[PDB]
Amino acid sequence: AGVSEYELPEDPKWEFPRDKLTLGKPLGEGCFGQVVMAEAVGIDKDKPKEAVTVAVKMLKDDATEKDLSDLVSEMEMMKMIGKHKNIINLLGACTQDGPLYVIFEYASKGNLREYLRARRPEEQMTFKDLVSCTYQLARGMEYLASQKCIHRDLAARNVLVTENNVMKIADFGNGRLPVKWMAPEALFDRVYTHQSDVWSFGVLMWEIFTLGGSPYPGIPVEELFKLLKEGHRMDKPANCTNELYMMMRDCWHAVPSQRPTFKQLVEDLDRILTLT
Numbered sequence: 184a185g186v187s188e189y190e191l192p193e194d195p196k197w198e199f200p201r202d203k204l205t206l207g208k209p210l211g212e213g214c215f216g217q218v219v220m221a222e223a224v225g226i227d228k229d230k231p232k233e234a235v236t237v238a239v240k241m242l243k244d245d246a247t248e249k250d251l252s253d254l255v256s257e258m259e260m261m262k263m264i265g266k267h268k269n270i271i272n273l274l275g276a277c278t279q280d281g282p283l284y285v286i287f288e289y290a291s292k293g294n295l296r297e298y299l300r301a302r303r304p305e306e307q308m309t310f311k312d313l314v315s316c317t318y319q320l321a322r323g324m325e326y327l328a329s330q331k332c333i334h335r336d337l338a339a340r341n342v343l344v345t346e347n348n349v350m351k352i353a354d355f356g357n358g359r360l361p362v363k364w365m366a367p368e369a370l371f372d373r374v375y376t377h378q379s380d381v382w383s384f385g386v387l388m389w390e391i392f393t394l395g396g397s398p399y400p401g402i403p404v405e406e407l408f409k410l411l412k413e414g415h416r417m418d419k420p421a422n423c424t425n426e427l428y429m430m431m432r433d434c435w436h437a438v439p440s441q442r443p444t445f446k447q448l449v450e451d452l453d454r455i456l457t458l459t
């Protein structure tokens with residue numbers, strides 16, 4: 184069974200009272216797991232008695248030892264990674280004496296895709312906004328890259344926006360496979376790397392500046408690889424500057440090597456932002 188019976192649950196400092204945690208509506212679908220909107224009370228170790236909205240990862244109906252043992256090993260990662268502004272971090276947990284819950288940061292705004300699809304020509308997204316979004320994610324992607332973690336599905340749907348409009352990257356820890364966000368090598372060799380990630384970021388960028396748009400919109404998946412193998416690259420987005428279109432293409436460089444470094448992107452993006 185699930186409620187720890189014979190497993191080894193060690194006692195942490197992260198653990199939170201199951202009392203104040205109250206589980207509510209689920210959030211989206213499950214490509215990471217069964218996430219639920221939960222309302223914890225006093226989790227900031229600075230605002231007690233002050234209730235807070237959080238997100239939690241309960242287990243599924245058809246769960247298994249693996250389906251558990253995986254979650255704990257994930258919970259362990261989300262502690263190793265550390266804390267960054269542009270990523271969803273471990274907020275707390277409810278391990279011992281009952282079912283395993285994992286508490287992360289909640290985002291009041293939805294996924295970028297649907298956020299960007301609702302702020303396009305009442306909060307009209309100034310290009311100036313568009314470039315901050317990209318910078319944020321990139322610097323988070325850089326952080327994530329530091330501790331050597333790969334992004335499963337780096338898409339706008341797998342990226343979130345707080346009430347503070349700070350872009351948070353989810354996915355660093357199933358369903359269909361996002362082929363259009365995957366690079367030639369990764370779509371052929373089926374092993375991911377940072378170079379493949381840079382590509383996926385390039386695709387993310389296109390997805391941002393197009394304001395929640397469909398990659399390769401029309402190309403059948405069966406021939407996509409062949410087109411990329413030839414050189415097919417997505418055409419410039421509207422209202423996008425050439426320099427930003429170039430950077431995307433640079434991310435989409437055939438040979439993994441000559442593709443831009445995460446740092447290389449972060450620097451370039453900051454310099455662009457200073458000139459807005």
Ligand SMILES: C=CC(=O)Nc1ccc(-c2c(C#Cc3cnc4c(c3)ncn4C)c3c(N)ncnc3n2C)cc1
Nearest residue numbers: 210211212214215238271287288289290353354355356
């Ligand atoms: C595949 C379709 C679909 O609906 N996906 C999806 C994606 C995110 C959410 C979601 C949140 C989440 C999460 C999460 C899970 N595990 C992670 C992680 C982030 N960072 C690292 N680990 C290991 C989420 C949240 N934390 N707070 C508020 N809203 C959230 N949503 C909507 C849902 C569905």
